[PDB]
Design a protein around this ligand. Structure first.
Ligand SMILES: CC(C)=CCC/C(C)=C/CC/C(C)=C/CONC(=O)CP(=O)(O)O
Ligand SMILES: [Zn+2]
Lengths: 323, 6, 407
């Protein structure tokens, strides 16, 4: 009815229809700590919210009051709980509430409560028909909104709406191939549909990624995805990978490619490859280059890896102390 | 512009 | 040498750490370039002003900022009206790190206020009369332990707290943040943190919790809010810290985790980002860097022989430089990054991260690294609870004197 931002907005203590209710002041105690000096509007709304909550007045006016309390602080989970109590108790039209939450999320998309509220509504209605499109609009403003992606995964998983998501993922990767959220979503979709075991799928993904790596060699997301989808089966399980990466050394080098090489060498030494020693030195050389020149911010990590490899892969690693 | 964690 | 620059971020080679966008511009590279340009200005300020650099932690200013906030806040904090126990915790911990005494007048007033925030059903709410919630419950307990007096400890109703935790426990091992609320890894950490400190952990309270948390580790090596989600420093800290409390860190692939977090430190800025391809932020100086002390302890517990005996596995010097040169507000308090305004949240975590970066300790071994003036050294913080290590010991010892509710 009367918006919190309306020029003709009136404090609740000045509203006739609320005259029967005595506001309930916040009980901060005798000598308060971290006491917030609330504005007039804020304190007035919450003093009345405290009153309806206390009386557990499940009325239309209380329902409208929660909208203002939420507007003043959408992070107040207690108000959201009461609002949901009122939604059911008063038999409120949930589609109308859906329109309401769609608007609140648009203005405060990084809030936890708003997304949880929307989820509850979808659950109550058992209707995901508006979700992918609504989320798409939010992601169009912040392509990395964590809550948005989390809600999207939930909807897709619960209502089995996998059919067009990979396509959606390709669209956003086109827009920004560096969007780590989209790479995560790509792995989410594939994992729950075909899986990465089907060799045709794994092949397709690796080709796609190496192709993306060529276009933007310093994009860490493509590299992490490449490693993420092959590390479980073991990098050494794929002999051509190493060679092909060494071929990008010239015109596509980066501390990322050098790092991957070390991971490949590491797994090779873990699955006792040929030229045990030759591979180790190749690895320690790279670890040093990274720690001293190519990636010094991670010097402590690279020196640790170098040490770890040395510790269990040097020719003298399995040799008795007496020898 | 601020961090939200709850 | 006389030509040698002691500050890592001001060395000539450092210029090579600037972003290489491969002439392919996207929203991500553009935003990253903007930050680096602003950070470069800060680094270059001394040179362009013809002054010798001096990294000073503005203790005096931060103290005034905290001292006042602990008592009164402007309406700018209306957005945190449902998180007042957090304000108590953030501020009290910052004062603790800065080694500033907590007057018993204050301590008792904090205790009384948190008491008003405690729910009849158990747990603490974000303010008097608010329903209980695991986030403010975690903050409340931490604040009371920082105070560490008999009065503070006695505020916590252990029987109800445990009852509250049980009412939120789910069949899959997870916990709701509050009744009718959302589920994510934060709840596991909040629950395990308050339950372990107050000694109320029963045999089945955390059944399946370690497994649920392990399901949140993804292809990236890091941990997401829920199974399937992108890896994030906030959720990763919660996941690992909770697992450490439950002594189940091994349920995770610690190696992929280690590789992921170390990659989260920005080569140019020196600070950490919260997730791959996003921006540096001072609060991650704790959520991210704080993982290294946890990983060090876990790997060492497995007998890892390659573990350094003097440093954490991240550039301690660079982190301190980022925080000291880019995260302090001249009026007191700390912040996200240059251009962002101060707040108690960042004041708490920037200092916590600074402490982590200054103090290394693996059992008997102890090595410090204090960049800038020696007065910059802070009190150490416990990597699991983020309160003084002495306060953790004191609190746990005290509650072990009590019997786990219901025996
Ligand atoms: C004990 C608690 C309550 C820990 C939680 C700590 C954090 C930092 C949680 C973050 C949750 C999250 C991923 C929120 C989404 O919004 N955040 C961002 O987008 C910030 P960034 O760009 O740095 O990822
Ligand atoms: Zn932050």
């Amino acid at each position: 009815f009367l918006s919190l931002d309306s020029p003709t907005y009136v404090l609740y203590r000045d509203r006739a229809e609320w005259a029967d209710i005595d506001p309930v002041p916040q009980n901060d105690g005798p000598s308060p700590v971290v006491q917030i000096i609330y504005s007039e509007k804020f304190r007035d709304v919450y003093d009345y919210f405290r009153a309806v909550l206390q009386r557990d007045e499940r009325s239309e006016r209380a329902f409208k009051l929660t909208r203002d309390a939420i507007e003043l602080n959408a992070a107040n989970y207690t108000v959201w709980h009461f609002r949901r109590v009122l939604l059911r108790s008063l038999q409120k039209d949930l589609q109308e509430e859906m329109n309401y939450i769609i608007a609140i999320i648009e203005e405060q998309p990084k809030n936890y409560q708003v997304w949880h509220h929307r989820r509850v509504l979808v659950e109550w209605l058992k209707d995901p028909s508006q979700e992918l499109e609504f989320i798409a609009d939010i992601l169009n403003q912040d392509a990395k909104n964590y809550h948005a992606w989390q809600h999207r995964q939930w909807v897709i998983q619960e209502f089995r709406l996998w059919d067009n998501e990979l396509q959606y993922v390709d669209q956003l990767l086109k827009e920004d191939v560096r969007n780590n959220s989209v790479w995560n979503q790509r792995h989410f979709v594939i994992s729950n549909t075909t899986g990465y075991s089907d060799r045709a799928v794994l092949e397709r993904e690796v080709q796609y990624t190496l192709e993306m790596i060529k276009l933007v060699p310093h994009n860490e997301s493509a590299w992490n995805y490449l490693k993420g989808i092959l590390q479980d089966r073991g990098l050494s399980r794929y002999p051509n990978l190493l060679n092909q990466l060494l071929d990008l050394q010239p015109s596509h080098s980066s501390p990322y490619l050098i790092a991957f090489l070390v991971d490949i060498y590491e797994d090779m030494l873990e699955n006792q490859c040929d030229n045990k020693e030759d591979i180790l030195n190749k690895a320690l050389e790279l670890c040093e280059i990274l720690a001293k020149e190519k990636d010094t911010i991670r010097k402590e990590y690279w020196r640790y890896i170098g040490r770890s490899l040395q510790s269990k892969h040097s020719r003298e690693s399995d040799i008795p102390a007496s020898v | 512009t601020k961090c939200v964690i709850f | 040498p006389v030509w040698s620059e002691p500050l890592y971020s001001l060395r000539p080679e450092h210029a090579r750490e600037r972003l290489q966008d491969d002439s392919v511009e996207t929203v991500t590279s553009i935003e990253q370039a903007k930050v680096e340009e602003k950070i470069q200005e800060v680094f270059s300020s001394y040179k362009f002003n013809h002054l010798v650099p001096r990294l000073v932690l503005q203790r005096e200013k931060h103290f005034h900022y905290l001292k006042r906030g602990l008592r009164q806040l402007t309406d700018a904090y209306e957005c945190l009206d449902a998180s007042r126990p957090w304000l108590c915790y953030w501020i009290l911990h910052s004062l603790e790190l800065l080694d500033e005494p907590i007057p018993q007048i204050v301590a008792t007033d904090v205790c009384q206020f948190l008491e008003l925030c405690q729910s009849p059903d158990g747990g603490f709410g974000g303010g008097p009369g608010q329903y209980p919630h695991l986030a403010p419950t975690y903050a409340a307990v931490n604040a009371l332990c920082i105070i560490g007096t008999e009065e503070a400890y006695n505020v916590i109703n252990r029987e109800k707290l445990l009852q509250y935790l049980y009412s939120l426990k789910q069949p899959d091992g997870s916990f709701l943040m509050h009744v009718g609320g959302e589920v994510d890894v934060r709840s596991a950490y909040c629950a395990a943190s308050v339950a372990s400190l107050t000694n109320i952990i029963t045999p089945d309270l955390f059944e399946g919790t370690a497994e649920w948390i392990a399901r949140c580790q993804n292809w990236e090596g890091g941990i997401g809010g829920v199974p399937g989600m992108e890896a994030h420093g906030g959720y990763t800290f919660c996941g690992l810290a909770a697992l450490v409390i439950l002594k189940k860190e091994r349920s995770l692939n610690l190696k992929s985790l280690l590789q992921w977090v170390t990659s989260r430190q920005m080569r140019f800025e020196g600070g950490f980002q919260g997730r791959c391809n996003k921006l540096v932020d001072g609060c991650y100086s704790f959520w991210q860097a704080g993982l290294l002390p946890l990983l060090h302890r876990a790997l060492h517990a497995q007998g890892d022989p390659a573990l350094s005996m003097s440093h954490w596995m991240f550039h301690q010097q660079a982190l301190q430089e980022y925080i000291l040169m880019c995260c302090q507000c001249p009026a007191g308090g700390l912040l996200d990054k240059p251009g962002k305004s101060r707040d108690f949240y960042h004041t708490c975590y920037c200092l916590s991260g600074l402490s982590i970066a200054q103090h290394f300790g693996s059992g008997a071994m102890l090595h410090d690294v204090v960049m800038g003036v020696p007065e910059n050294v802070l009190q150490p913080t416990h990597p699991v609870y983020n309160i003084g290590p002495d306060k953790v010991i004191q609190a746990t010892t005290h509650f072990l004197q009590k019997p786990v509710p219901g025996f």
